Amino acid sequence: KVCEISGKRPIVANSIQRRGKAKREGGVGKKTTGISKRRQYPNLQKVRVRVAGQEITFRVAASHIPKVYELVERAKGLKLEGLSPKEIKKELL
Amino acid sequence: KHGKRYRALLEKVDPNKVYTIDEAARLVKELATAKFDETVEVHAKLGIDPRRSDQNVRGTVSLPHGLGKQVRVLAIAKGEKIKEAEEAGADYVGGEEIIQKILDGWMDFDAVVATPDVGAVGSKGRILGPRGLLPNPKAGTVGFNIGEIIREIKAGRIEFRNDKTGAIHAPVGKASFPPEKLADNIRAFIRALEAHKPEGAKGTFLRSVYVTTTMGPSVRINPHS
Amino acid sequence: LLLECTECKRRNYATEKNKRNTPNKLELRKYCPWCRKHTVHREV
RNA sequence: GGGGCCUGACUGCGAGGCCUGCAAGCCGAGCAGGGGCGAAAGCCGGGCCUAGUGAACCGGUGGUCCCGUGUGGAAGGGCCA
RNA sequence: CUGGUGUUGGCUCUUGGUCGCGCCUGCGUAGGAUAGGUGGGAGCCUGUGAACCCCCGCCUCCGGGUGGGGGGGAGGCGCCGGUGAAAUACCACCCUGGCGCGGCUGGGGGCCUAACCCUCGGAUGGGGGGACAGCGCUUGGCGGGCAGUUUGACUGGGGCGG
RNA sequence: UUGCCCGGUGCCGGAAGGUCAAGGGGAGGGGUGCAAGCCCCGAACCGAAGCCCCGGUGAACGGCGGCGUAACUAUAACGG
RNA sequence: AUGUUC
RNA sequence: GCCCGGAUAGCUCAGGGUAGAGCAGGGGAUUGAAAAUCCCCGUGUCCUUGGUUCGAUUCCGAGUCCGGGCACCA
Ligand SMILES: [Mg+2]
Ligand SMILES: [Mg+2]
Ligand SMILES: [Mg+2]
Ligand SMILES: [Mg+2]
Ligand SMILES: [Mg+2]
Ligand SMILES: [Mg+2]
Ligand SMILES: [Mg+2]
Ligand SMILES: [Mg+2]
DSSP states (O other): OOOTTTOOOOEEEEEEEEEEEOTTTTOSEEEEEEEEEEEEOOOEEEEEOOOSSSOOEEEEEGGGHHHHHHHHHTTSSSOOOSSOHHHHHHHOO | OOOHHHHHHHTTOOSSOOEETTHHHHHHTTSOOSSSOOEEEEEEEOSSOTTSTTSOOEEEEOOTTOOSOOOOEEEEOOTTTTHHHHTTTOSBOOOSTHHHHOSSSOOOOSEEEEOTTOOHHHHOOTTTTTTTOSOOSSSSOBOSOHHHHHHHHHTTOEEEEOOTTSEEEEEEEETTSOHHHHHHHHHHHHHHHHTTOOSSOOSOSSSEEEEEETTSOOEEEESOO | OEEOEEOTTSOOOOOEEOOTTTTOSSOOOOBOOSSSSOBOOEEO
C-alpha cells in the first residue's frame, strides 16, 4: 500500500526475461523470452513514536522513516491534546 | 644442528640485507672456510610455472675465467672426428666400441660428448641418462664440431637447468678466484638466464637469487649490480 | 582445416586451407598483396 | 607414370556467351599490376570433367580513402576481407 | 526455496578459505633404511663433549624421522662398496603437506532488548519470541499448480514405413 | 497373506568433491583532459539454494525379461 | 571360527 | 562455447622408469578319491596428437569420444 508521508504507492513494472549473450560481449545479442506485468511495492514499515501523551504509529516507506522524527520534533511548537491520536496524526503537518 | 665452524659464519651475513654482485664476490671467499677449494654456487628461484614444460630454462653458458675445474671429457665418434677430438682436448676417445666398456662399472669421466652419427649411443643411456651425462643437443654436448665443443667445455662451459621446483643452480667458480673474477662470472650467468626467459611467463623472472659455497651459508643478492 | 595468409608483419589476406595432420606446420607461400605489391605470407 | 624449379589455389577487371521463372549456377578470350616455369613458342586466375553444398538476417575477428549527434576525440556503425 | 540488501540494534564465542611469518614435513620395490627436487660436494662433525645406553618434545607409514637434553668420555659420519631409476656426510635454493601465531574474506552459534511478531481478566504497563521471523528491492533455483503455444510435407485415403 | 530388485525417477538424509547468480574483489587494460581527474573494460580469488555426487526409502514412480543339469522320454529340486 | 561327499 | 572428470587386455576394473589383479580356458599342487582351496601360463597402439625427458600410460599443452554443471546456437 501507501507511504503516509511521501505518498509512495505500488507501481506496475514489467519483468523482462532475456536469454542470449549481450552484443556488448560475444554477441548476436539478447532475446526477450517473456515480459510480464508485476508490481513493485514501496518498503512500508511501521513506526511508533511517542508525541504528546498518546503513542501514534505511521505506515511509512523506509526511505522517509526519518521524516517521521523530523515531524515529531517540529510539533513541539503545537498545542497537542485530547485522547485522539487520530487528531494528533492529521495535526502532523 | 650446525657446525661450530658454520655458526661462525652466520655472524658474517645479514639475513635481510641484500648484497651486490661484488659485495657478495668480496664476501664469498671468506665464507669458504672448509678444508678445500670450495665451489661458488649461484641459486635463482624463478618465476615460471615449473609444470609448464616449455617454460623450462635449460641452457649452457660459456664462462670467462672458466670454472677452476678439471672436467674429464669422454668422446664418441667415427671416421676423422675421432682424432679432431683426441686432440682438441679429450682424455678418452673414441669411438663406438667403449659402450661395451660401459659394461658398466666404468664411470671415471665427468662429462660426455658425441657426434650426431652416433643415435645408436642413446639406446644402450639408461645408465648414462639419469646422471645427466648423456650427450644431448638440448644443453651442450652433441655436434659435428666436437672439438669446438670439447674445447669450451674445458674452459668451463656449464649446463644449467631449472628443476621441478622452479629453482635453478650453477657452479660459477671457486672461492679462490679474485672477487673481480667471480663477480664477472656471476654476471655472465644471470645474463644467460635472463636470455633464456621463457617468453610467456608471469611474475618477475628472477624472484630470488643467492650466492653461496659448498659448505657455506648463502647471500641473498641483487642481480644487475 | 580453413585458414588465412598474411603479407609479412601485417594485414592482407587471401585464405585457403590445409589438411593439418598431413603437411601442415606454418603455411609459407609467395603471393601478391593488394596493399604494396608482392610477398611471402604466413598462415593465421 | 617419374623427375626439376615453383605457388597464377594471383590482385584489378572482364568482351562475349552457355544455362535460366527469380535468385543462383557455368565457361571465358583479352587488358593492366606484379609474378612462376620454359632457351623459346608459349603455358599458369587450382585440381580430366560433371557431387564435396546453404539466400538473407544477427553477431565475431583483421584491415580501411568512409560517418562520428554543438566542436575535438571516443563509443558505435560503414566499406574490404 | 536461496544469496545480497532495507526494515536491523547491543555484546560476545569460533570457524573455514587464503597470504606474510615461523616451526615441522617427505616411507613402492630393492637397499644399512623413512632416498621430496635440483645445485654444489671430497670432505664434514666432534672438550662449542663421538659411539653407546637413558628421558623430554613434537612428527609417525609404529619402522622409525626430527629437535633438544641426562649420564658417558673419543670416536662418528661421508667418499669406497652392495642395492637402486636415483644416494647417502655436509651446504644451498626450492609450501610438497601439515601445524602455530597473525593479517585480509567468508560461514555458523550463543547471550541481550529496544525495533519488529505473538500474548496478558484492556496495558504508559506485564509475559513469550527477537534482529531471527514477517514485509520491500534484487539474485539464482524448483515449479503442467497455471498460462500461451508448437507438434512439417510427399503419400494411388490417412497412419506405419519410406 | 502381501515375495524379489533401491540401478533410473521421486521423497528423506548427507558441511568429500564437481559446477553454478547477483554481489565482493580489483592482477592488468582503455577513452579523454596540460594535469589533479572523470568515465569505462577486466584476470586470480571469495560468493547461496540448485543439479551432479554419497546413503536410505516398496502399502514411494516403478521393474520382476530372458545356456547346461536327474532311471529313455519329458521336466528340471541344482548350477551358470 | 567355518569346511561337503564315497 | 566455459569449468570439471573419464578413456588401460575379451568384459569389469587397479595403478616418470615397471603394465597389472579379477572373471573364463589350461597345466600343476592338496585328497585314497571327488569337490572346495592354493600356484603358474598366454592377453594390451595404456583414446589420438604434438611437447618435457636419457626414458611418458604416468608430467605439459593441444584435439577427438564420453560423463557432470553452467553458458548459447546466427
Ligand atoms: Mg536510504
Ligand atoms: Mg557478362
Ligand atoms: Mg529474420
Ligand atoms: Mg553485420
Ligand atoms: Mg562530437
Ligand atoms: Mg525469479
Ligand atoms: Mg498446457
Ligand atoms: Mg540408491
